[PDB]
Amino acid sequence: PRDPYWYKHAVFYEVLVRGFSDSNDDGTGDLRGLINRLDYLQWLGIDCIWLLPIYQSPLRDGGYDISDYTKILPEFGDLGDFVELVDEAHRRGIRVIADLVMNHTSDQHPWFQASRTDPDGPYGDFYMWSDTDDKYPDARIIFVDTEVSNWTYDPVRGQYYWHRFFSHQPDLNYDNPAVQEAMLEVLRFWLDLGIDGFRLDAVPYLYAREGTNCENLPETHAYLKRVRAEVDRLYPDRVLLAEANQWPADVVEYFGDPATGGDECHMAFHFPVMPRIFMAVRREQRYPISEIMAQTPKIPENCQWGIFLRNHDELTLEMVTDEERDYMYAEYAKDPRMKANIGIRRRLAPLLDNDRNQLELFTALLLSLPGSPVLYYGDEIGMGDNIWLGDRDSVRTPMQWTPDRNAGFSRCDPARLYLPVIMDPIYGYQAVNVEAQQRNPGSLLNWTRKMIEIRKRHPVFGLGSYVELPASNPSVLAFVREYGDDRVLCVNNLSRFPQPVELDLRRFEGCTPVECMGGVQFPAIGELPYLLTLPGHGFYWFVL
Template sequence: MTGAEMLERFQRQGSERLARIYPDEQVKDLLDQIVAELQSFSDTAATEPINRLWSEQDLILISYGDSICAAGLAPVQVLCSFLEQHLSGIVNTVHLLPFFPYSSDDGFAVVDYQSVNPRLGDWGEIAAINRNFDLMVDLVINHVSSQHRWFQEYLHDEAPGKNYFITPPKDADLSHVVRPRQSPLLTEVETNRGSAKVWTTFSADQVDTNFSNPDVLLEYIKVLLFYLSQGARFIRLDAVAFLWKEWGTSCLNLPQTHEIVKLLRNIIETVAPKSVLLTETNLPHQQNLSYFGDSNEAHMVYQFSLSPLLLHGLYRGTSLYLCEWARSRCNAPPGCTFLNFTASHDGVGLRPLEGLLPQGEIDLLLHGMEKFGGLVSYKANDDGSRSPYEINIGYFDALKGTWLGDDCWQLARFLLAQTLMIGLRGIPALYLHSLLATPNDHDGVAQSGRARSINRHRWQQQELEELLDDQQSNQAKVFFELRRRLQIRRQQPAFHPDGRQEILHLGEYLFGFWRFSPDGKQKLFAVHNLTEQPRNLYVDGALDGQFNGRWVGLLTGEIVTSERAVIELPPYHVLWLAQQQE
C-alpha cells in the first residue's frame, strides 16, 4: 500500500472516529487539519507490509533517565553507557520514563513536551540510546504541568490555552468520578478573569486538558508525530483512561476515550506502521482489557494483574489464584499482546486484584508488605471513604520472606518471580531496579515526601559498578543470573508473543504452562515451585501424555526423559524443558 493509499484509508477511518466524538460541524475541519499534519510527516512513499510487530527477541527495560548518575556526565549518557556495556544484545527496547522538563511527579507533570530536561541531557543523548535500542516514549496525554505554556495562557486569558482546560459549572454532578488520589478533584486558581476551579485528577500541579475542545486533540496528535519523528517505536499513553469527562458519570473509560485511542492507532498505522501503541490503564482486569477493543485499539496493554497476583502467590506459597487468573483471563485478541512486568516506577497496583483475590488475602498481603518495609497508598472513594490503591515497595524486598516471616530464600524467590514473568505470553518488561535487586529507598521517601520514591533509587555509577564486580553482592547475583536467563529466552521461538500458551493444573504449590512457537516447531514446558519446600511433579498425571522423548533443561542443563515418572523441584526452582532434537 502506498503512502497516498494509507492516507486515503485514514481519512475514512478518521471521519468515522471523529463523528463519534465531536459534533458534526467540527468533524470536517478537524479531519482536514489532522490529514495535513500526516501529509507533512510522511512523504507518501510506498510502505513495506508489516508481517509481525514483535518476536521472542523483544525485551523492554524500564528506567528513568537519571537512575544511574556520575559526576560531570549527563545522566542519559551514563545510562546509555551502562546499557551498551551490560545489556546490548539482550535488551532491545528502552522505556525511558518522561525525560522532559517537569514540575512534579518525577516527570509526569510535563512543562514542555518537545524538550529534553537539561538536567538529564539533550536530544543528542536520547538519539545515542536510540542507535542501539528501540525507544518507548510516554505521551502524558491526560494533563499538563501548571507551569506549561498552555496553562499559563489559561491563567492570562490568552489563546489558545485559555480554552484548553476544564472548569465544571457549580451544579455539575461530580459525585461518581473515579480517581486514584485523595487530593481535591478541583483546584482553585486565580486568573485574569477571577477565581476558577480547574480539574486536577492527580494533583494540583497536574491540570487535566479538555479533549471536548478538538484543538486539544490536534495538539496531542502533533506531539505524537514529533515523538515518532524522534525515533520512538513504542508510544505509551499515560493515564489515558481518565481522558474524557462528562458530568454525572465516572469519567473513566468513557466511549470517547476509546475512540481517541483508536484514532491514535489509525494515525500510527498510517505514518509509522512499525510502531506500537501501549495504554497504561491501572484498573480492574476486565476494564484494562477493554483497551484492546476489537483488535483495533491498543496494540498492547499492561498485564497489571500479574504483579500483585504473583507477589501474593509467593508470599502465601500457593498457585491457586494465579493459576485461575492465567487460565481464564490471560488471553489477548489477534494482533495484540500484553506487556508483562512485575515492577515499574509505580507501586504494585491493587485495583487489578478486584474480583481475583478475596479481601482477606489482600489484607494479609498488605500487612506482610508493611513488615518488609513497604508503604501503602490510598485512593478516595465517592462515599468519602478511602481504600488501598497500591503497595509502594521494591519488588526485591517484597520477596524477602513469606507470611511466616523473613527467611533465606529471597534471591531464589525473586529470580523465580522474574523468570515466571518473562516466560508468560506477551512482551516482558523489566524495571532497571529489578535487574539490579535495588532495596527499598527509605532515604528517598524521606527526602521527597512521596511513597513512590521507595522504588525510584538513583544509583551512583561507581558504587553500582563496584557491587556488580563483587560476586557476593545481591546486585551481582541477580543481575548476571537474570541476564543469562534473558539470553536463553531470546533464543526460544516458543516464547514468541504470538505463540500459544496452555496453563496447567499442577496442584496448589506449582505453576506450570506450555508455550508453543507460532510455526509449531518448538514446544516448551515451564514449571515453578512457589514454596520453600521441595515438591514433586508427577509427569504422567500432570502432562497428559504430551511429555514424550528426551528433554533438556534450558536453565539448569538436566536431561529428562519420559521414563522418569517424577521430577523433583527444589525450593523456588524453575524448570524450562525443551524437547531435544534427534
C-alpha cells in the same frame, strides 16, 4: 526486514535517566551517560529501553507533571543527545519507547497559563472548565489523602478547573479538537526523532461525561483508535502501550476491536500478576496465579499483555485491585509484609527479603508467563531501595556499577548527588554492584542474563499458547508453551519445601526433554506420570 509486532517477543528495560549514568559529573545522570552504557544493555540482552519521563517539568510529581512536551530537561542533555541515543540503540538492535502523559500537564505549562489570561484565545478552552464544582460527581478522588477536590477554583480565571490527579496537573479538554490535534502533534514530534513508541499515561481519564464514571469512556477509546491510525500511517513498526490502573477486563477494551487483530493500543499492563504471585508463594498454592490466568479475557491476536514484578503503578502509588472482581481483594492486607509497603514502590529483592531462591522463582515466572516482560533497572543485580527519601516513589537511587566512588555512577562529590547511593550493609554498593556481579559466575546478574538469553532463543515465550497442566500437587504450577514446533515445559514450586509433581505428559510421548540451563537430556516421556522433583521455590525449564 520490517517487524510490525516486535513487542510480542521483546524484553523491556525500564530506566531512570537521572539515575543510570553520569558523564558530565555534575551528580545527575544524562542521556550521554545512558548512551555510554548501551554496551551493557546489549550484553544483558534486552530488546527495548523504556525511558521514564525526561520532559521539562517543575518536578512536582516525579516528572509526570509535564511543562513542555517537546523540550528535554537541561539536567539530562539536549534533543541532539536523544537523537544519538535512538540511533546508537538501533545500531545495537535495541528499541526505545517513553512514558508520555496524555491526560494532563502541569499548571506551569504555557497552554494552561494561556488558558487563563484569555478564555477567548486559541488555548482558552484547552482545559476543562466549569462554574460549579458539582459536575461529574461519580468520579472518585484518586489522591483521597491529599485532594478534597476534583474541581478546584482558579482565581485569575475566576472559575473551577478539572483534574483527576493533583491540583497542579490540570486535565486537558479532550472534547476540544485543538487539543486532540496539539497532542497528536506531540506524538509526531518524538516519532520524527525516531522513537519507537510510547506508554500513554493516564488514558483512562481523557474524556469525562456527566452521568458516568469518567474513566474508560467510549469516547476515550475512540480517540485512541484515532491515534493508532495516524501513527500506523506515518511511521512503520511503532508501538503504543496503555497504562490503565484498572482490572484486566476493563483494560482489555483498550486493545480495540478484536476483529482487526487490534486497532487501538498494542499493549497494556496486567497489574494483578505480581500481587497474585506474591499471594501464591505465601499460601504455597498455585490457585491465585491459576485464577487470573483463566479469568482474563482473550485479547486481539496482535496485542500483548505487559508484565512486571511490582505491586503498584508508578503514576499512582496504588495497587490495582477491585473489590468486586478480585477474590483476593481483602486478603492482601492480611499479610503484614504486604500492608507495610502499601503506598510505597519497592524493588524486587527487598520485596522478597533478599531471598535468592525466591528471586529466581519470581523472575522465572515473569519471563515465562504469556506477555512481554519489563525489568526495572537495578533488579538484575539485586539492588535494594531507600524509603525515607523521598519517598513512596524512590527506588530511583543511582545504579550501582562498580565498587568505586558513588558506585561508579558519577565522579562527583557525594554532596552533589541528586539522590544518595545506597550504603546499606545488605544492598549497599560495596556488596551489591554490577562489576562484582559480572565477575562472579554464580551471581544473580549472570543468572538473569542466561535466562534472558534462553528466552530469546525461544519465541514461544512471547508468541505461544499457554495451557496449564493438572497436577495433584497444589504447591506446583506447571504449564506448557507452544508456538508451532517450539514447545517448552515450565514447572514452578511455590512451596518453600521440596515437592514432587506428577505430570501427565502423554501428549508429548516419545519426547526427550532438554533442560534449558544446562542442556541435559532427561528420560523420554512415556505414558505413566512423569515425576519432577523441585527444591523449595525451585523451577525448571524444559524444551520438548
